[PDB]
Amino acid sequence: KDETVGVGVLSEPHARLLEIAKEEVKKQHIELRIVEFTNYVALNEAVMRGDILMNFFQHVPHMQQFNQEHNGDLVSVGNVHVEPLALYSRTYRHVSDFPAGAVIAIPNDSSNEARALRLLEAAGFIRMRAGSGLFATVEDVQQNVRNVVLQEVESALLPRVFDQVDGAVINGNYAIMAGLSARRDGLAVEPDASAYANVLVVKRGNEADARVQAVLRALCGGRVRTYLKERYKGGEVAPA
Numbered sequence: 001k002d003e004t005v006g007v008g009v010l011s012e013p014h015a016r017l018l019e020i021a022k023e024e025v026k027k028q029h030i031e032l033r034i035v036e037f038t039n040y041v042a043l044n045e046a047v048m049r050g051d052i053l054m055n056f057f058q059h060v061p062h063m064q065q066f067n068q069e070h071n072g073d074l075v076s077v078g079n080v081h082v083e084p085l086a087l088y089s090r091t092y093r094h095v096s097d098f099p100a101g102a103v104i105a106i107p108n109d110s111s112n113e114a115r116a117l118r119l120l121e122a123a124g125f126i127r128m129r130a131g132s133g134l135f136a137t138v139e140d141v142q143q144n145v146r147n148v149v150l151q152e153v154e155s156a157l158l159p160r161v162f163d164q165v166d167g168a169v170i171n172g173n174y175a176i177m178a179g180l181s182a183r184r185d186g187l188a189v190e191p192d193a194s195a196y197a198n199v200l201v202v203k204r205g206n207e208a209d210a211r212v213q214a215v216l217r218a219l220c221g222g223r224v225r226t227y228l229k230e231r232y233k234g235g236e237v238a239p240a
């Protein structure tokens with residue numbers, strides 16, 4: 001009898017957070033159906049077509065990129081958590097250990113590629129051109145200080161090529177799934193993780209939907225905040 005609303009998810013840690021949310025909104029007689037997808041575009045297109053009411057897997061710059069490129073009308077209804085982006089290495093233990101010519105793999109979707117490039121800039125490896133913007137890519141690199149080779153790779157595959165490159169800038173969700181902690185294993189962290197807070201997203205016009213608001217309240221509630229602080233003591237995933 002409870003009405004059902006679908007929420008698209010990509011992977012941990014968002015999936016576990018939606019499971020906590022599912023239990024909580026069940027109390028208001030809302031049955032949260034967690035729908036599992038395999039790629040970024042499919043998740044946003046499903047919300048645009050109306051196959052699911054919301055999704056939970058990206059940050060605002062990514063959503064903005066999708067709106068611009070795919071004529072989307074998605075909006076964030078709230079920040080939920082931050083997952084710091086970090087540079088990891090299969091062998092080097094210090095950022096200054098990287099030899100000239102070292103190969104560093106980074107995300108290939110523009111908003112996370114820019115984010116990763118600004119992380120490497122902050123660590124002193126490169127300098128980005130001035131009017132680069134939120135969707136900057138390797139073509140925007142103005143100077144290569146440490147003489148590094150930057151390889152663009154699909155985010156989900158970064159952990160798979162990790163043992164074959166000198167380093168890799170890996171999104172927190174994929175790093176955690178591969179046993180990497182930005183605090184314990186990272187050699188450098190992005191300069192502004194809070195700007196890349198992950199958000200609950202819906203089509204413009206559904207922000208006030210009462211079911212959406214309940215899921216949001218549950219994702220930002222004391223029980224989720226408590227869960228995060230306890231499971232990710234290094235702040236790998238932290239309430240926004």
Ligand code: MET
Binds near residue numbers: 085112172173
């Ligand atoms: C699809 S945008 C990237 C989301 C990812 N969980 C991150 O915060 O790096």
